[PDB]
Design a protein around this ligand. Structure first.
Ligand SMILES: Nc1nc2c(c(=O)[nH]1)N[C@H]1C(S)=C(S)[C@@H](COP(=O)(O)OP(=O)(O)OC[C@H]3O[C@@H](n4cnc5c(=O)[nH]c(N)nc54)[C@H](O)[C@@H]3O)O[C@H]1N2
Ligand SMILES: Nc1nc2c(c(=O)[nH]1)N[C@H]1C(S)=C(S)[C@@H](COP(=O)(O)OP(=O)(O)OC[C@H]3O[C@@H](n4cnc5c(=O)[nH]c(N)nc54)[C@H](O)[C@@H]3O)O[C@H]1N2
Ligand SMILES: Nc1nc2c(c(=O)[nH]1)N[C@H]1C(S)=C(S)[C@@H](COP(=O)(O)OP(=O)(O)OC[C@H]3O[C@@H](n4cnc5c(=O)[nH]c(N)nc54)[C@H](O)[C@@H]3O)O[C@H]1N2
Ligand SMILES: Nc1nc2c(c(=O)[nH]1)N[C@H]1C(S)=C(S)[C@@H](COP(=O)(O)OP(=O)(O)OC[C@H]3O[C@@H](n4cnc5c(=O)[nH]c(N)nc54)[C@H](O)[C@@H]3O)O[C@H]1N2
Ligand code: F3S
Ligand code: F3S
Ligand code: FES
Ligand SMILES: [Mo+4]
Ligand SMILES: [Mo+4]
Ligand SMILES: [O]
Ligand SMILES: [O]
Lengths: 132, 843, 843
């Protein structure tokens, strides 16, 4: 009751992830669009054997515009007001109108390689509680 | 990457108290509301229980009014109790339409909170240098010391011995109440000559040029950016620096969203989607955003050489004139037709330092300004076909022989740029020639910095040109310095030398005060004056935080900023709003206007005791008990149309307020002015605009050509979208300092590789003026030999390498700076976490 | 009153990680645990869901282990991640039994948190004075500069040109790792003589007296305070200054709770509730608490004249010896019998400055110290009856003529009191003569300040007396100053003159650095050395916050403190514990032992480059990569019983640890020493204790009698309960600063009436040494003419009015200070919310 109680939700398997191709996901419910993504390098918040699998809300924390991935620069890009987020560095706003770095998922890889989300490190766009 | 780990915010209840709030920060003046409610109450997820009448148990979609980010939430004191506060963009404000920038959206978390531990740097008490360090004291004690040293020094050496640095701007750290209070103390009660402004080292206008021509620099509305055929943006990075004016008004034009409104408001002519010329030596995120919303076809980025805008504009003026792409009726009806003789020293120098440009008719100006496409190409390093196309995009008529509508926008690339007076003039020539002033879709305007909130008694005594205050201080002149709401240590020109000497002179007074008895005040005062007489300086700082120049000051007085007080200001549209107090001043801090009144009251008492009742009587008229008293004595009595404006009337009109000047009051509505110069009568004795005979004469500020010639790199300088000004609040905001713990210097990747530099490295920029430090940020879009350093930044001050060079009117030529770059150290470990990717959005 | 409005805390979940934490702060070393768990997780009300195994949906009753305050909760970085943390007093620790002081209980709230915005003042980055202000830089760059300057100066002028100020204490800002690191650097690699300690301006001991007599000052156990017939408490305010020793051990003795234990551990002698003698000129909350728990009749408050302890002790020793109220057997078997000749200049002066007192037999010391009740009552201001009763409570055999058990505890009222050496000896005299060393219910002990964590090489080169470092600096000597974890601007003696000169000398070097190019590091170093050669000082600060003395320093190195590092230290009964690292250092901050190591690495590199390979080799043996390497190179190899102690074994023992020295390791337990000297073999060559022939000679430090006679009030000084030390953490803690924004000066209300003062008034304290400020606090229990000012406080430094005066061994006599008091200002507005009521508990 003091903190938000986060579901431990199954998102995908490590086998479902192609290098540099976002897998569309929802966490912590259906209406909280995000992605899983393998980056082929060890980075902040990264899980799996290479420590390169990250999970992010993919709804701009500025005004709720769906973000889009650039494979060449490995950045989320907002076509709303031109915000750029770096999922190699914990989803830092590289430039943008958000007062938040990109809300990022707490991932756990079980033995079978099934990937789980246990929480989010920032307030998701369009909900005043990450769990609704 | 910095994460708040705030999973959940309190819901604003249905019965929350609503306050109209204008953004504290930039010119755009985005509308917000502050909702406050008791700390032990909250809102419900059901419609009847929150402020939005919406079910918040359900995800909200893009552009929702029924959401706020963590930075929009805090807990603050109100009437001496903790309340929840949310500071949210107003969806119904015509300026922003519920947009908030990275800056305005953190008003709440950059507020002072004991409960949530935000901005504990905020000053709570008067501080005095005694017993060998800064010590908190009472207002009565601090004011008595300030007045006794001030009164003695001006009595003994004249008012010329009192030096003043002060804000002249609107919004937080400015505004009509605070400009009036400081203005009345130094210009009514006294005749202070040796006063400078927050951003320039003399008491001058940024834009004497446009003003001498009879064109006030804020002459249009924000709608005109939606209605223009072409936008000409000169030395503006509007997406970073005028963010929601660009996003809410320029973008719709460039994207065609505007076409429907154009056709409704101007049938009887053709309308395509807006195009844009961007005059800026550097490719910005503004150039990128424009390309990406209107396509490269509709965007002409003129990457001029540094400080050659005047050459470009004279060539556009020449070409447009020679084609007759001009509003003949406008020129004949509304501009000066009488020929007038060039000054003797023309074209090298004006008739005087006071008047560096020659005002004249259309025809005299064209022949004066006359420059070939070939020559501008040589100077600007543009291609002929770029300049000719720029001419066509401004001048060439639309299908039915109809006038092309052009909004001309400029800011500090021009104003802090080469030959301020002439460049400003050359740009006004283009808007005048094409009848793009006082018409829909037109204007030749500053895009602005702070909001505006200026009302002061006459400054006639100050002179033109006015005193170069920094040179007086560096040269060992003046006895007492009052500093209000500026920090020269981070933001003045020639800042390295300024600091060298400012420290020595304040150190002399510090040593004297450490060695003298404080509890016997008269002996303390005499030790101060004796130290001043050896070449010392007594410094008083009025601020909201411990400043960098404040580390040299002997007295600090704590100010209350916008939101802790009622504050009135207007935006780059002249849109006047009341920011309604929603919270308490921290500790004993008090509004600047009431500090001025209190210092005035103390000056009166001290001067009476010294036995000069006549001088003491000049310090009457300062019985204000609240900021509203300052509004009524100042704006209400002295502003054009002031008699129509009160707090109550301004409150009723909300975040849309009204455009100045006010013309009347009719059933709960102040009537305003959408556009200036609609009747073609300009701000001159006879009502005619003057053109400017403004010939190119190279880099006009002393030593600039030498500095270009004798150093390897251009140190271009200015704003980051994340950083507000000198990071006075940002330096205690983990979100901003997580992004840039060091000021970035944008460098070409090939330039970095040739200099043995990698991303994050700490580098010394050095030249004739001084030295400073920054973190190398690899920028593919940067031209080779051309760097950009974030200005005014506490962890590396760009001002240290800017020279003392000004134009004849003492305008600081910050942007034309060259220096060398060497390595200090490898990337510090605290930059390892930084993103070094392009700021440019990719489709 | 400051309220956090935190009406709900995250519950520790049942799988939270447990760390053993000794309190950061005072000597008592109360046991705590740090519970951390992942952000995004929490425990529940149900027993299986929380660490307590208890239904938290029920109200907990008094003294529950299943609660914590807001001050005990925070969010910190652990291994690069944000975790919840509760730092909670350990119920199973025998030191405190789940008690936390107002200081230990705010360990969490005074930890660095980006997420909760606590202690943002914490240093994250090296800083260097360049380009007109302090600038952040890399470890490589900052260490290089410190190394190059330190190396050049030492090589041209010798090691005597290096001045060091460093902690020698335990806990946060010391401990075995940190003292060893610093010690090895300046005593092994170098032979620095011009070194002082955090609390005294020479490299001396607080208590050469007790040590020269062969009695180590920490010779008992805390249980002794439970088992004693009489506690003798000299110059200690233990409720405020040794809170949980007082509360968890003295109190049980005074209200008879320990009687059961006394009868069991010591059968065949009588036992009643403990009585207490408090020797303190000031009536403290401790005196009040004692009266309240034991009854007025079991408390003898000897409110002596300031600085007259020695007279009282000599008189008690005389009375006790004449009555034969001594342990003949203890004296004959364990103390020196062979008489010895008084030195030439006795009684006024010892044989030398090195040896102020005469070490001798029992009988010789009785005759040398000989003083009558009549004389001591005249000197001390006590009734003859109070001194007789005190001799009876100390020496008179119990029913059946069983020896009375007496614990003699002293702290800074004696140590910073008049004639340190002889007063210390006179007290030890009383304990030796009564056989109250090495036995249950006995001891003659320092009650202590910080925890203890001293291990360093030989200091023999320092000499005795050692150099008065402050007088060196004030008199223009030394070239480089390394300052570790102390702030003389707030805490040294003669602090006004110290700051005046320290500012001047550091300014000379600041001015040079500002005019020199930094990018040419060789030019910079030259400018610095040239300024040093003109009488300037280059000053390097190793700390965790921006210090007051830091405002004068050229380089600042950020340190990590207890909890962000593993740390070992022992308490007032030698109970060694490991504080297990539970969080990360803020920013690039690093443990002091590792900064010492890194600086030694940099000295070696730099001395190689300079040629001198011989001098460079001396800085080898610093390859440490974690604090445990310092522990193993220092304590493990060099401490008495070190061989038996490792982190792993200390960890196993938890917050009860073991009492040093370690005698063995067996069955997973370090075997300790409950008491020293139980075999009556003392720390001299021949194993006998010496008595001290220690006659009263009035106020012994220079100028002290002159200062008393020429000033109106005693300015007594020392600690507040709420405040930890120089308020270095407390200054960014709203709970503390809300209580005392100014240091209090306790003043008799009649004294206030006479001087025209009201509660809260800002007063100046002034005398021959300097001047300072405090807030007047009406204190009915204050004797007329006697005031008490909070020491070390940032918003009014009491040190400013202490003289340079020391005893022959350079012991600062802070407690004997006299001054005048005059109003600066009526009670400031920021003090209106304060309670001015009595600090004394009422039934
Ligand atoms: N090289 C270079 N230098 C530049 C520029 C550049 O482009 N290049 N730009 C120039 C320009 S355009 C500007 S605006 C200047 C800015 O120069 P400054 O005015 O020195 O910079 P700010 O950070 O706006 O300073 C505002 C100060 O006012 C204080 N303050 C805020 N609110 C209040 C309030 O309510 N009351 C009081 N009393 N104080 C308050 C803040 O704490 C801070 O110290 O810099 C100029 N300097
Ligand atoms: N995010 C943010 N927004 C702000 C501020 C802030 O601190 N942060 N401050 C506000 C204030 S006080 C001000 S004054 C404005 C400043 O607003 P702008 O003037 O728009 O901003 P700057 O970054 O100072 O400079 C604008 C552009 O001038 C270009 N420039 C440099 N030299 C030349 C030259 O010779 N010719 C031309 N044509 N361009 C040149 C630079 O490359 C830069 O892109 O921003 C305001 N808004
Ligand atoms: N709350 C709190 N506790 C602390 C500290 C802290 O800052 N705050 N700091 C710790 C440290 S480092 C230390 S050294 C200890 C100090 O602990 P203490 O030594 O107990 O404390 P002080 O307040 O320095 O002085 C104790 C008493 O000495 C008395 N005194 C003054 N002059 C004389 C004199 O001539 N003779 C005698 N007999 N008494 C005299 C004063 O009236 C005062 O009550 O406390 C430790 N504990
Ligand atoms: N008039 C008068 N003066 C006195 C006394 C008195 O009774 N009367 N008492 C004396 C006594 S007993 C003492 S103990 C002294 C105290 O004198 P100081 O030692 O000057 O006082 P503290 O506040 O303990 O200073 C500790 C410093 O170390 C820093 N610090 C904390 N943790 C760490 C760490 O892990 N590493 C590093 N590098 N720094 C750290 C703190 O921020 C602070 O600046 O004052 C003395 N002064
Ligand atoms: S939110 Fe504030 S900073 Fe400028 S763009 Fe809008 S006014
Ligand atoms: S809690 Fe800490 S401050 Fe002393 S009394 Fe116990 S050790
Ligand atoms: S919604 Fe993404 S930048 Fe505005
Ligand atoms: Mo500006
Ligand atoms: Mo101490
Ligand atoms: O500005
Ligand atoms: O101490």
């Amino acid at each position: 009751a003091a903190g938000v109680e986060y579901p431990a939700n199954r998102l995908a398997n490590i086998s479902e992830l192609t290098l540099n191709e976002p897998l569309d996901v929802a966490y912590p419910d259906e209406d909280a669009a995000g992605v899983l993504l393998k980056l082929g390098t060890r980075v902040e918040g990264g899980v799996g054997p290479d420590g390169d699998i990250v999970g992010f809300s993919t709804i701009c924390p500025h005004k709720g515009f769906p973000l889009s991935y650039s494979a060449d620069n490995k950045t989320f890009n907002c076509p709303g007001h031109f915000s750029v987020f770096d999922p190699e560095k914990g989803g830092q706003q590289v430039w943008g109108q958000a007062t938040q770095n990109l809300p990022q998922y707490v991932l756990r890889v079980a033995d079978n390689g099934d990937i789980f989300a246990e929480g989010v490190d920032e307030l998701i766009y369009g909900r005043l509680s990450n769990v609704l | 990457a910095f994460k708040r780990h705030i999973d959940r915010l309190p819901i604003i209840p249905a019965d929350a108290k609503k306050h109209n709030v204008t953004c504290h920060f930039c010119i755009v003046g985005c509308g917000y509301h502050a909702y406050t409610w008791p700390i032990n109450k909250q809102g419900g997820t059901d419609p009847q229980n929150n402020i939005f009448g919406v079910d918040l148990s359900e995800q909200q979609q893009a552009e929702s009014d029924a959401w706020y980010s963590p930075s929009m939430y805090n807990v603050v004191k109100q009437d001496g109790r903790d309340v929840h506060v949310v500071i949210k963009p107003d969806h119904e404000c015509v300026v922003n339409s519920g947009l908030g920038s990275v800056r305005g959206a953190r008003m709440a978390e950059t507020s002072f909170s004991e409960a949530r531990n935000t901005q504990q740097q905020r000053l709570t008490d008067p501080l005095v240098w005694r017993y060998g360090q800064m010590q908190p004291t009472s207002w009565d004690d601090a004011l008595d010391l300030v007045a006794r040293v001030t009164a003695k020094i001006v009595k003994e050496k004249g008012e010329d011995a009192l030096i003043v640095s002060a804000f002249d701007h609107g919004g937080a750290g400015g505004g009509y109440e605070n400009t009036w209070g400081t203005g009345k103390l130094y210009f009514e009660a006294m005749k202070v000559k040796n006063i400078r402004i927050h951003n320039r080292p003399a008491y001058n206008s940024e834009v004497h040029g446009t003003r001498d021509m009879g064109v006030g620099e804020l002459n249009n509305c924000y709608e005109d950016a939606e209605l223009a055929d072409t936008i000409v943006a000169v030395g503006t990075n509007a997406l970073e620096t005028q963010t929601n004016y660009f996003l809410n008004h320029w973008i719709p034009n460039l994207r065609g969203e505007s076409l429907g409104k154009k056709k409704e408001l101007m049938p009887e002519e053709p309308h395509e989607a807006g195009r844009i010329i961007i005059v800026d030596p550097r490719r910005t995120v503004t150039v990128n955003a424009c390309e990406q919303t209107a396509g490269a076809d509709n965007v002409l980025h003129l990457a001029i050489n540094s400080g050659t805008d005047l050459a470009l504009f004279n060539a556009l003026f020449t070409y447009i004139a020679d084609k007759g792409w001009v509003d003949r009726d406008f020129i004949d009806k509304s501009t000066l037709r009488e020929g007038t003789a060039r000054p003797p020293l023309y074209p090298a120098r004006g008739v005087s330092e006071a008047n560096p440009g020659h005002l004249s008719s259309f025809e005299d100006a064209v022949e004066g300004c006359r420059m070939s496409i070939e020559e501008a190409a040589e100077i600007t390093g543009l291609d002929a076909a770029q300049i000719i196309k720029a001419a066509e995009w401004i001048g060439m008529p639309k299908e039915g022989g109809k006038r092309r509508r052009v909004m001309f926008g400029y800011e500090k690339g021009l104003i802090w740029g080469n030959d301020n007076y002439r460049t400003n003039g050359a740009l006004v020539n283009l808007a005048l020639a094409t009848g793009n002033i006082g018409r829909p879709g037109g204007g030749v305007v500053r895009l602005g910095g702070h909001q505006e909130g200026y009302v002061r008694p006459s400054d006639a005594h100050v002179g033109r040109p006015a005193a170069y205050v920094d040179q007086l201080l560096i040269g060992g002149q003046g006895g007492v310095h009052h500093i209000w709401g500026c920090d020269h240590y981070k933001t003045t020109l020639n800042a390295h030398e300024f600091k060298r000497v400012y420290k020595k002179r304040t150190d002399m007074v510090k040593d004297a005060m450490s060695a003298a008895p404080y509890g016997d005040r008269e002996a303390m005062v005499n030790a101060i004056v004796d130290a001043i007489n050896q070449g010392g300086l007594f410094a008083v700082n009025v601020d909201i935080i411990p400043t960098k120049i404040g580390e040299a000051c002997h007295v600090i007085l704590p100010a209350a900023t916008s939101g802790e007080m009622n504050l009135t200001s207007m935006n780059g549209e002249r849109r006047m709003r009341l920011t309604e107090r929603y919270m308490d001043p921290p500790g004993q801090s008090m509004p600047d206007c009431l500090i001025a009144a209190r210092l005035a009251n103390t000056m009166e008492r001290v001067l009476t005791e010294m036995g000069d009742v006549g001088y003491a009587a000049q310090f009457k008229g300062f019985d204000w008990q609240t900021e509203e008293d300052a509004f009524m004595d100042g704006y209400n009595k002295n502003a054009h149309g002031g008699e129509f404006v009160t707090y109550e009337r301004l409150s009723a009109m909300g975040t849309n307020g009204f455009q100045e000047p006010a013309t009347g009051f009719t059933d709960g509505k102040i009537e305003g002015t959408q556009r200036l110069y609609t009747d073609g009568v300009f701000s001159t004795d006879d009502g005619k605009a003057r053109f400017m005979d403004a010939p190119w004469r190279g880099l006009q500020a002393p030593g600039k050509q030498q500095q270009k010639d004798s150093h390897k790199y251009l140190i271009n300088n200015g704003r980051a979208n994340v950083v507000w000004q000198s990071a006075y609040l940002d330096q205690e905001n983990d979100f901003v300092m997580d992004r840039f713990p060091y000021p970035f210097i944008e460098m070409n990747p090939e330039d970095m590789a040739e200099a043995g530099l990698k991303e994050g490295d700490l580098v010394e920029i050095y030249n004739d003026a001084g030295a400073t430090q920054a973190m190398a940020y690899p920028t593919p879009t940067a031209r080779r030999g051309e760097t950009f350093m974030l200005f005014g930044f506490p962890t590396g001050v760009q001002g240290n390498v800017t020279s003392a060079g000004t134009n004849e009117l003492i305008i600081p030529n910050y942007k034309q700076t060259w220096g060398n770059i060497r390595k200090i150290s490898d990337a510090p470990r605290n930059v390892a976490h930084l993103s070094f990717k392009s700021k440019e959005y990719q489709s």
